[PDB]
Design a protein around this ligand. Structure first.
Ligand SMILES: Nc1ncnc2c1ncn2[C@@H]1O[C@H](COP(=O)(O)OP(=O)(O)OP(O)(O)=S)[C@@H](O)[C@H]1O
Ligand SMILES: Nc1ncnc2c1ncn2[C@@H]1O[C@H](COP(=O)(O)OP(=O)(O)OP(O)(O)=S)[C@@H](O)[C@H]1O
Ligand SMILES: Nc1ncnc2c1ncn2[C@@H]1O[C@H](COP(=O)(O)OP(=O)(O)OP(O)(O)=S)[C@@H](O)[C@H]1O
Ligand SMILES: Nc1ncnc2c1ncn2[C@@H]1O[C@H](COP(=O)(O)OP(=O)(O)OP(O)(O)=S)[C@@H](O)[C@H]1O
Ligand SMILES: Nc1ncnc2c1ncn2[C@@H]1O[C@H](COP(=O)(O)OP(=O)(O)OP(O)(O)=S)[C@@H](O)[C@H]1O
Lengths: 70, 219, 227, 359, 239, 228, 380
């Protein structure tokens, strides 16, 4: 239904800083680097400008069922 | 490319596997069914591929699978629930068996108790080539089986196996072995050394597994 | 205000004066049930009264994040009481077969048999007839509190609260706006205020007049036919 | 006159109980031990005074033991003390404490006694003679060599006083009380039922003489939940584990079991056989005589204005329980303190009757 | 029609619905009945009326003939059907043989109907239990009870309904021959038995007698009040 | 798990008839003994209450003027069959001017011992002992719910039939007399009953070629019991 | 008093008298030996992949660290260092010292019985043929491999038991477990149900590991319906992990190098939902069943529960048995105990016949609405 097509146009017409983020990029091999990458994105966001973050497909992140064993 | 056994559960399919192990001097390779089931995601594929690799590097390679239906399950598209990883191992078995990168140094023998469980891609016609059915032993084969398992026991030679085979209705070979062994022990109850025909009759009566409850009032 | 008086008499009165109940000598209550249409104040009343009576508000509904904060996620749900004994003036509140089962364990503890008092439970749901009959034993829930949809004066009060953050204009008739609503919810009037702000914003204007409110009424009553 | 000599010699024995070089030996045990005592985890035990442990990361070591503490306090799945420099077994660590225990064990004197129950008098002596008189007076059963009755099922319509009866047994007691509502045996993970069951009865059999009261167990079959794996083919296995744990092997012990239901006909009868549960007790809606005791006791601690008659309330509902009586006797008080009063008039009971019953 | 067998035997040798339809009898109103030698008496307890309505329609004691009397327990509708069929049968007996209908005949009819009713194809068994009191020729008082199985079964005093074990235990320690000497005392004996049963406020105590050469008389509940009053007077005279 | 009621077994029998043979076992006992002098018979009433008037319980009922009977367990299923058996014996004496022999009676009963079905319901739940004196001398006959009818010389049924058959085979032989068999039966009775044996517990029924009709009023039972 | 004061004086005289040795003599029960255990070694354990040729040259995965190529020390044997073998390896120089038993998954260690619950063969009287057959299978080859060898047979390596519930299955198992003489290993059927896929398979693996290590042992399975009975296949994918657990139970039981000196006893309450792969003999050979005790069985079970209790021996027991046509031993036990409980209503020391009649009409006729066997005799 044209989901990313509008974020593309917003990235085109804007003047602000625009950071694309792969959804599953945070979960990585080494321990704890995920929350550190969250810190990284948000520190740079606080740094740059009035800016725009687009995170694609947070279904990789926001899953309402967990298992604190694995 | 590969031969499948199937049939009723007591016709004997482990027998040919152990037989060809006893006869063919190739690298005979066994594999239980649920041993390809793993807990960690992605180790069953590694296990299948390592099994095929160790078969390839010992080139005359006979791989036996018992109860292939453990990993062979008909897939389905549902929501909220569903087994996945076992189908991943199954697809790894398929593709490392057949499809892309074919091979000539592998020999596959599978045997399930039931047939209708499996996906059609497991069989298709070049994954498991020769479909081989096993029937129940007809008449003389039951006598043949009971005659085989009576070998080491001291049979008194006044025992007609034809009577036994014609009264053992709808048994498998395993139940015939059970008949012969329980006949031996029923003879061991009274302590007599060599067997008798009545011992075989009572062994058949024990193997039939009546549940009575004292039915006497007939005729 | 009547529901306020009810929750006063059933929660503020045990906390500030237990010995009124212990002099009159009945069971001090332990359970409140809130019903009504969804969006009529089922949350703000509970949170607010729990804030004014100085009680540690706790809303455990259904996450596993919560199941990591309370305990280690091992086996059950009763460890919320372990964290509630340490902050003893506290209140547990819930949204809408799972939450009812949760309430069964909650009440089955604190129906006289779990601890010293100052711990209560509140459920907010809609359409009372969809819950368990075993919960509907009359010795189980103490008060059942209705939330009607708001009337003309009620919507007028809601509008005069939610309009107190905008940039309004003199000579505006709020009762016309309340008497154009088809008995809207307590949530939707806030939506009217926000869309009025949006309509004033698109005009590059700084004040908000009644035209923006009336077009916001039109927008919300057009959204009312969306599912 | 035996008090003087008995007290002198008993105090001498008590001071010799505290009278059990030596400080040099304590310092040598402290020299063997390290100061940063690290914690490990046993996996197996090898009989040659050194065994295998498991560190917190997964590394595992064949380490000897500083054998003065009882190593035979330890099993697989235990917590030990280890060194940094040689990883050796410093000794035993006392057990970790205790979220399942602290949740599932009622510690306190838990409410009113048999002075609050409303006119049963026959069910009461049955649960008395099944739990109280066996446990508190274990002398009659020696005379006849008859084992006590094991399980007791309370059942009946809702509102009759199963929960009160459990609380009253838990009042006058000498044993550790264990309370689990039966609806907590339905988990959203597979294979979590038997873990709860084995931990529950492990707690029961390890701690003390005990009373495990399991309430509303009939809701385990007639309540399917979306927050679940495959429902009935896990619930049945959970019931089977409860069954085997209740009347299985290895000398069951001093554990009493009382269960309470609303309906009984939806139960798997394999629990309901004797050998597991010996007493099955009906709780009916009582009469129009013990109702007077119920209204009396639930109005025994209030400034009752004497212009009311309790017989006006007995006749009112034909099948009212003690739940309805408590509900009216508290709602009338809620109407009383609504208007800043102490005594309770008749119209208070009328409004309370029209509030409890017909809404 | 409905080609099925509702009532199957058990695996351990029962009829589920015959033994289980006795529970519906067990959860109904209580009713006792004794025979004296010249006056017969019976009555039901636990009308459990609303005390403010009609009572001529809830009458649990009726008659089939001018000679025979009813009582029952269980649910009332099956009793209504069985009573209608019993009236038809007794009057049809009067059509043939010119006697007044013997009580043993009508009890055999009721029990026979009940058994061929339980036997048949898909008919739910009758969850009632009746009391059939009458005094046939030469004035002999007799009384029989029924059962959902269909066993007419002659007694000397009654034990049905709610808590019948307690009532029969009182009749057990009250089997005095002296009690059936004075007709008034037999009436008072029924009142004392039913007094050792439920509230017995003198409201739900509905009793009717027959002096075996008359028809049934339903007593007006002021005479029963004086009966309860003189019973309480004798109970005070016991101390 | 409810199957069809006309299902055989995995082993072979049926179900519902087997459950009927189980349902016999809860009933009261009865003992009949064939003797060439005549057939004697005994039963236990199982009196429960003193309010329960004792002379009204029927165990020995009358089929013909010379064909006796006794029932067991369920009473009323037996009552239907007793009524019908009487009707069919009356049809035989009517259309034949002669006495329907006891074997022909019991053939007529076990023709519909199993006609249980859904069209054209359950199997009956009673064991029956049939006596009488036909032209073939005295006869003692025993049927079952399954219609498997056999002659028995002295059969004991119901709840105490194991020790009754055993201790009966202890005392029985071919040349017994009448009164010896009567007291030989009631000794077994007051070894297998639970209450004290007295005037009200048991009842006899003896039919002879000489004592032509089965006749047994009360208080000769007193004379028989005080002879113990 | 005199015993109390004199025992206090004597025991505290010994105590305060040894107090002289307590305050005069101035742990070390091992201290010099433990400091001679300071020249010992930390000895980290590992897992071996394979060996190499012409030389030892061994290859090891430790557990998490890495994989190293090692050499053996001088105090080893060059033979018993085969593949897949948990060996203790030096921390510094990485060298193999001692081979050990493998990993046993310690949640499986706690189902060996380690005790003997006291249940005698006398407690299951009235079941003589069943005791005979189960004796013949379980007891006789472990105690007498004489007839079984000199005639040349093999005893049936598996026996299943069933019946109505409460019939003596558990009790017969415990009666064997008294006189077992073997490594009796309990298995509840619900032990094979874990959170993760194919985990119960590994449990079965470790069971037969323990079985093959210790010769001549017993394994008891209990309520095998949880382990798996049917392979109902639909378009849902429901009960499947249980099914794979059941198949792994099949194969490592019997087929392709059979089991060794192990005997399996299973016991179910409903032997009707079972996949006939278990019903194949060679795995589950003798179908021993427990019916109800018919007439003399209940007399004997009254003799069992009555022999050590306070009764009036002038009463009979046959009349008691005649009122219990379809009843289990559990109901018999309830009758005996409840008759005692009616004796506790009064204050007596001997039972009466009326107490037992109260017990019969208290248990059987009253709670026969529940009664546990009108729908298990049909084996639903
Ligand atoms: N106005 C339009 N409506 C629909 N499709 C359009 C439109 N304009 C361009 N397209 C084309 O169709 C695509 C629309 O799909 P997307 O923008 O990729 O949405 P989406 O990312 O696929 O959402 P998904 O599938 O849930 S990840 C565009 O990328 C163009 O290729
Ligand atoms: N000629 C024969 N035909 C059939 N059975 C035989 C024969 N010879 C021996 N047997 C018996 O067959 C048994 C093997 O049966 P199984 O291998 O268990 O059946 P199956 O073919 O393995 O089916 P499964 O268990 O599902 S793989 C042996 O134990 C022998 O006793
Ligand atoms: N008394 C009130 N007057 C005006 N607005 C209100 C009032 N109560 C709530 N609101 C607004 O309406 C929204 C929804 O009301 P809530 O109190 O959250 O009830 P609710 O959460 O909708 O109940 P649910 O949806 O069934 S959980 C809130 O977020 C407020 O913005
Ligand atoms: N017989 C009784 N006498 C006095 N109060 C009673 C009686 N029965 C119930 N109550 C009242 O009911 C409360 C206890 O509730 P219960 O009757 O035990 O509820 P419950 O129906 O057993 O709940 P369950 O076990 O889930 S059905 C007490 O606080 C009493 O006020
Ligand atoms: N035949 C019997 N003889 C003597 N006592 C018996 C007999 N059967 C059962 N009991 C007693 O009743 C108890 C119950 O028998 P169990 O075998 O424990 O029941 P069960 O095997 O658990 O049945 P389930 O519920 O299907 S597992 C036994 O432990 C004995 O105390």
């Amino acid at each position: 239904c044209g989901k990313t097509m509008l974020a593309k146009a917003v990235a085109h017409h804007t003047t602000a800083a625009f950071i694309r983020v792969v959804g599953s990029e945070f979960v990585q091999k080494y321990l704890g680097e995920g929350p550190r990458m969250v810190r990284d994105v948000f520190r740079l966001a606080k740094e740059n400008a009035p800016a725009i973050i687009f995170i694609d497909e947070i279904d990789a992140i926001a899953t309402k069922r967990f298992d604190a064993q694995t | 490319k590969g031969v499948l056994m199937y049939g009723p559960p007591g016709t004997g399919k482990t027998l040919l596997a152990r037989a060809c192990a006893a006869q063919t001097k190739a690298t005979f390779l066994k594999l239980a069914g649920p041993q390809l089931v793993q807990m960690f995601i992605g180790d069953g594929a590694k296990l299948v591929r390592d099994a095929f690799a160790l078969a390839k590097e010992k080139a005359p390679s006979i791989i036996f699978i018992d109860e292939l239906d453990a990993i062979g399950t008909k897939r389905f598209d549902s929501e909220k629930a569903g087994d996945r990883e076992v189908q991943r191992t199954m697809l790894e078995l398929l593709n490392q068996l057949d499809g892309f990168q074919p091979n000539t140094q592998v020999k596959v023998i599978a045997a399930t108790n039931r047939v209708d469980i499996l996906d059609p891609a497991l069989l298709r016609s070049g994954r498991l080539d020769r479909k081989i059915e096993f029937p129940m032993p007809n008449e003389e084969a039951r006598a043949r089986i009971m005659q085989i398992h009576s070998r080491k026991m001291n049979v008194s030679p006044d025992v007609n196996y034809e009577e036994l085979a014609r009264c053992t209705d709808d048994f498998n070979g395993a139940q015939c072995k059970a008949v012969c062994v329980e006949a031996g022990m029923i003879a061991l109850r009274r302590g007599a050394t060599e067997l008798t025909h009545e011992d075989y009759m009572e062994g058949i009566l024990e193997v039939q597994a009546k549940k009575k409850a004292n039915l006497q009032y007939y005729a | 205000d009547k529901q306020i008086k009810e929750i006063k008499e059933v929660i503020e009165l045990p906390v500030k004066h237990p010995e009124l109940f212990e002099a009159l000598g009945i069971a001090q209550p332990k359970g409140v049930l809130l019903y009504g249409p969804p969006g009529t104040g089922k949350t703000l009343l509970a949170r607010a009264v729990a804030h004014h009576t100085d009680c540690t508000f706790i809303r455990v509904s259904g996450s596993e994040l919560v199941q990591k904060f309370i305990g280690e996620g091992a086996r059950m749900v009763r460890e919320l009481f372990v964290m509630a004994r340490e902050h003893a003036p506290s209140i547990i509140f819930m949204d809408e077969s799972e939450v009812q089962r949760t309430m069964l364990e909650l009440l089955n503890q604190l129906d006289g048999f779990e601890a010293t008092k100052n711990i209560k439970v509140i459920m907010a749901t809609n359409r009372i007839d969809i819950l368990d009959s075993a919960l509907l034993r009359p010795g189980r829930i103490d008060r059942k509190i209705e939330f009607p949809p708001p009337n003309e004066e009620a919507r007028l009060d809601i509008l005069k609260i939610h309009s107190r953050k905008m940039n309004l204009t003199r000579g505006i008739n709020l009762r016309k706006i309340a008497e154009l609503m088809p008995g809207a919810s307590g949530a939707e009037v806030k939506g009217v205020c926000t869309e009025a702000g949006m309509y004033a914003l698109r005009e590059r204007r700084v004040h908000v007049t009644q035209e923006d409110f009336e077009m916001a009424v039109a927008k919300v009553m057009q959204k009312d036919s969306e599912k | 006159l035996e008090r003087i000599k008995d007290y002198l010699l008993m105090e001498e024995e008590f001071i010799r109980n505290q009278e059990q070089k030596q400080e040099e030996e304590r310092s040598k045990v402290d020299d063997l031990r390290g100061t940063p005592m690290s914690v490990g985890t046993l996996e197996e035990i090898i009989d040659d005074n050194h065994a295998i442990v498991s560190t917190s990361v997964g590394s595992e070591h064949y380490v000897s033991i500083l054998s003065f503490v009882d190593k035979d306090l330890l099993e697989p799945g235990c917590s030990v003390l280890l060194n940094h420099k040689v990883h050796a077994v410093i000794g035993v660590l006392m057990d970790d404490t205790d979220p399942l225990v602290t949740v599932m064990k009622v510690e306190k004197a838990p409410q009113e006694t048999y002075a609050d129950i409303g006119g049963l008098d026959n069910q009461i002596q049955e649960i008395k003679e099944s739990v109280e008189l066996p446990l508190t007076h274990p002398e009659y059963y020696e005379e006849m060599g008859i084992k006590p009755p094991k399980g007791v099922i309370l059942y009946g319509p809702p509102g009759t006083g199963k929960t009160l009866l459990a609380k009253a047994v838990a009042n006058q007691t000498s044993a550790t009380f264990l309370r689990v509502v039966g609806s907590e045996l339905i988990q959203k993970y597979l294979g979590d039922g038997p873990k709860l069951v084995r931990e529950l009865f492990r707690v029961a059999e390890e701690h003390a003489p005990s009373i495990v009261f399991i309430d509303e167990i009939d809701a385990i079959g007639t309540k399917r939940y979306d927050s679940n794996s495959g429902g009935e083919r896990e619930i049945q296995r959970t019931m089977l584990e409860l069954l085997n744990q209740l009347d299985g092997f290895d000398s069951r012990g001093d554990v009493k079991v009382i269960m309470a239901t609303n309906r009984i006909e939806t139960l798997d009868p394999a629990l309901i056989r004797p050998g597991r549960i010996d007493r099955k007790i009906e709780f009916p809606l009582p009469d129009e005589k013990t109702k007077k005791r119920i209204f009396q006791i639930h109005t025994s601690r209030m400034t009752l204005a004497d212009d009311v008659t309790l017989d006006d309330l007995i006749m009112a509902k034909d099948d009212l329980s003690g739940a309805d009586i408590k509900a009216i006797c508290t709602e009338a008080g809620l109407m009383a303190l609504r208007e800043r009063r102490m005594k309770v008039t008749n119209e208070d009971f009328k409004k309370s009757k029209e509030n409890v019953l017909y809404k | 029609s409905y080609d099925r067998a509702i009532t199957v035997f058990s695996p351990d040798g029962h009829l589920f619905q015959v033994e289980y339809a006795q529970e519906a009898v067990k959860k109904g109103s209580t009713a006792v009945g004794v025979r004296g030698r010249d006056i017969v008496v019976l009555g039901v307890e636990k009308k459990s009326v609303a005390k403010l309505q009609d009572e001529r329609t809830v009458r649990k004691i009726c008659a089939l003939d001018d000679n025979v009397c009813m009582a029952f327990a269980g649910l009332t509708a099956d009793a209504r059907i069985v009573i209608n069929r019993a009236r038809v049968e007794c009057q049809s007996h009067r059509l043939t043989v010119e006697d007044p209908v013997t009580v043993e005949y009508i009890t055999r009819y009721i029990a026979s109907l009940k058994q061929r009713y339980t036997q048949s194809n898909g008919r739910r068994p009758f969850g009632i239990s009746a009391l059939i009191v009458g005094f046939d020729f030469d004035g002999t008082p007799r009384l029989y009870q029924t059962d959902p199985s269909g066993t007419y079964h002659a007694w000397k005093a009654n034990a049905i309904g709610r808590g019948a074990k307690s009532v029969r235990e009182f009749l057990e320690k009250n089997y005095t021959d002296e009690a059936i000497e004075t007709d008034d005392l037999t009436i008072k004996l029924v009142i004392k038995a039913l007094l050792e049963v439920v509230q017995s406020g003198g409201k739900n105590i509905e009793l009717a007698v027959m002096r075996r050469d008359q028809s049934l008389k339903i007593l007006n509940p002021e005479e029963i009040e004086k009966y309860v009053a003189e019973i309480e007077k004798e109970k005070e005279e016991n101390e | 798990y409810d199957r069809g009621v006309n299902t055989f077994s995995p082993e072979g029998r049926l179900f519902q008839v087997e459950y009927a043979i189980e349902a016999i076992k809860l009933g009261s006992t009865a003992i009949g003994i064939q003797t060439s002098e005549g057939v004697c018979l005994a039963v236990e009433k199982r009196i429960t209450s003193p309010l329960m008037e004792p002379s009204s319980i029927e165990k020995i009922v009358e089929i013909d003027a010379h064909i006796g009977c006794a029932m067991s367990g369920l009473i009323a299923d037996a009552k239907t069959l007793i009524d019908k058996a009487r009707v069919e014996t009356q049809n035989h004496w009517f259309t034949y001017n002669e006495t329907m022999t006891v074997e022909s009676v019991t053939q007529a009963v076990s023709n519909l011992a199993l006609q249980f079905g859904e069209e054209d319901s359950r199997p009956f739940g009673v064991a029956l002992l049939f006596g009488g004196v036909d032209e073939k001398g005295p006869q003692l006959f025993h049927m079952d719910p399954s219609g498997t009818f056999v002659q028995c010389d002295a059969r004991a049924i119901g709840s105490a039939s194991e020790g009754a058959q055993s201790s009966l085979q202890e005392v029985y032989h071919k040349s017994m007399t009448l009164k010896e068999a009567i007291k030989s039966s009631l000794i077994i009775l007051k070894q297998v009953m639970e209450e004290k044996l007295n005037a009200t517990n048991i009842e006899l029924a003896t039919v002879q070629p000489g004592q032509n009709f089965h006749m047994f009023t009360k208080e000769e039972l007193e004379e028989v019991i005080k002879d113990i | 008093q005199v015993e109390d004061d004199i025992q206090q004086l004597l025991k505290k005289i010994n105590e305060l008298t040894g107090i002289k040795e307590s305050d005069t003599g101035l742990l070390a029960a091992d201290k010099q030996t433990l400091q001679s255990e300071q020249p010992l070694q930390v000895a980290r354990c590992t897992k071996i992949i394979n060996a190499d040729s012409e030389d030892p040259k061994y290859i090891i995965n430790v557990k998490q660290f890495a994989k190293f190529v090692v050499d053996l020390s001088d105090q080893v044997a060059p033979t018993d260092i085969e593949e897949g073998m948990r060996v203790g390896v030096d921390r510094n120089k990485y060298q193999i010292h001692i081979p050990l038993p493998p990993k046993i998954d310690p949640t499986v260690t706690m189902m060996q019985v380690e005790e003997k619950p006291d249940v005698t063969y006398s407690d299951v009287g009235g079941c003589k043929e069943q005791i005979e057959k189960l004796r013949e299978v379980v007891e006789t080859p472990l105690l007498h491999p004489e007839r079984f060898v000199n005639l040349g047979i093999e005893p049936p390596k598996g026996v299943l038991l069933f019946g109505p519930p409460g019939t003596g299955k558990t009790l017969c198992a415990r009666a064997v477990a008294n006189r077992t003489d073997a490594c009796f290993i309990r298995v509840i059927g619900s032990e094979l149900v874990q959170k993760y896929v194919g985990e119960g398979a590994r449990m079965v693996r470790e069971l037969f590991e323990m079985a093959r290590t210790k010769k001549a042992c017993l394994i008891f399975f209990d309520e095998i319906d949880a382990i798996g009975g049917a392979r109902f296949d639909d378009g849902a994918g429901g009960d499947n992990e249980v099914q794979r657990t059941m198949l792994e139970l099949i194969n490592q039981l019997d087929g392709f190098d059979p089991r060794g000196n192990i005997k399996v006893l299973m016991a179910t309450n409903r032997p009707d939902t079972l996949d006939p792969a278990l019903m194949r003999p060679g795995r589950l050979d003798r179908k021993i069943e427990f019916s109800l005790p018919d007439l003399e069985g209940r007399t004997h079970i009254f003799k069992i529960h009555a022999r050590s209790m306070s009764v009036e021996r002038d009463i009979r027991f046959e009349l008691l048995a005649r009122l219990c046509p379809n009843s289990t031993g559990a109901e018999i036990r309830s009758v005996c105990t409840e008759a005692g409980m009616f004796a506790i209503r009064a204050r007596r020391k001997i039972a009466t016949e009326k107490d037992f009649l109260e017990a019969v009409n208290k248990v059987i006729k009253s709670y026969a609405k529940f009664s546990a066997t009108p729908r298990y005799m049909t084996y639903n």
